[PDB]
Design a protein around this ligand. Structure first.
Ligand SMILES: CNc1nc2nc(-c3ccc(P(=O)(O)O)cc3)n(CCOc3ccc(Cl)cc3)c2c(=O)[nH]1
Length: 187
């Protein structure tokens, strides 16, 4: 006597995500430049979000997007972030053209579609940096000492972007990034 959900039910993601924007407006404190766009926990709502906002390639230099599981703030300071690190994809300025938007989207669909299976717990979120000096996309993991997790994650990622095995990508811990110029792991 009830309706068959398939038709009218939204498709719930395994997690609620929060999309954040950072605009480099040099006359404000960094923490205050970072602002929450919106949150979503369903497939339909993700596409509503993605489609109504600018492609990463059309953001001006010094701006960022990032997507984090709800309750993880997208900064080193977060409880789930302080012991962690990231897989860094350094894109040059010719890959802003052919790669950026599809690397970022693939990243988004990796997070919310939980492509890391078991390891999906160690995932916190991801960041795309638009810079004049060449762009960045990073995946944040929770613990920079879970080698089995960190490296399987980084390897599924590399594969999921379609990167050839010539290209190596490195994982830096947050404590190193936050204090320094170097990779804990490479794939
Ligand atoms: C003490 N508070 C604090 N300051 C920070 N400064 C950075 C940071 C890291 C790298 C670069 P770069 O690529 O220009 O070299 C610039 C700044 N971060 C890391 C997060 O960055 C994010 C940027 C944008 C978004 Cl949408 C999310 C995170 C933090 C942070 O986590 N906490």
């Amino acid at each position: 006597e009830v309706a068959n959900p398939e038709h009218y039910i939204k498709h719930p993601l395994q997690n609620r995500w929060a999309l954040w924007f950072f605009k480099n407006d040099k006359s404000k404190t960094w923490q205050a430049n970072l602002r929450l766009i919106s949150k979503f926990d369903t497939v339909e709502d993700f596409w509503a979000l993605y489609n109504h906002i600018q492609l990463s390639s059309n953001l001006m230099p010094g701006c960022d997007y990032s997507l984090f599981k709800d309750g993880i703030e997208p900064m080193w300071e977060d409880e789930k972030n302080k012991r962690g690190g990231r897989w860094l994809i350094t894109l040059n300025k010719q890959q802003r053209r052919s790669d950026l938007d599809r690397f970022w989207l693939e990243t988004l669909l990796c997070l919310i579609g939980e492509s890391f299976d078991d390891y999906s717990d160690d995932v916190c979120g991801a960041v795309v940096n638009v810079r004049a000096k060449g762009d960045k996309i990073a995946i944040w993991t929770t613990e920079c000492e879970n080698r089995e997790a960190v490296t399987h994650i980084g390897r599924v990622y590399k594969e999921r972007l379609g990167l050839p095995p010539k290209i190596v990508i490195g994982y830096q811990s947050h404590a190193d990034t936050a204090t320094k110029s170097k990779n804990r792991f490479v794939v």
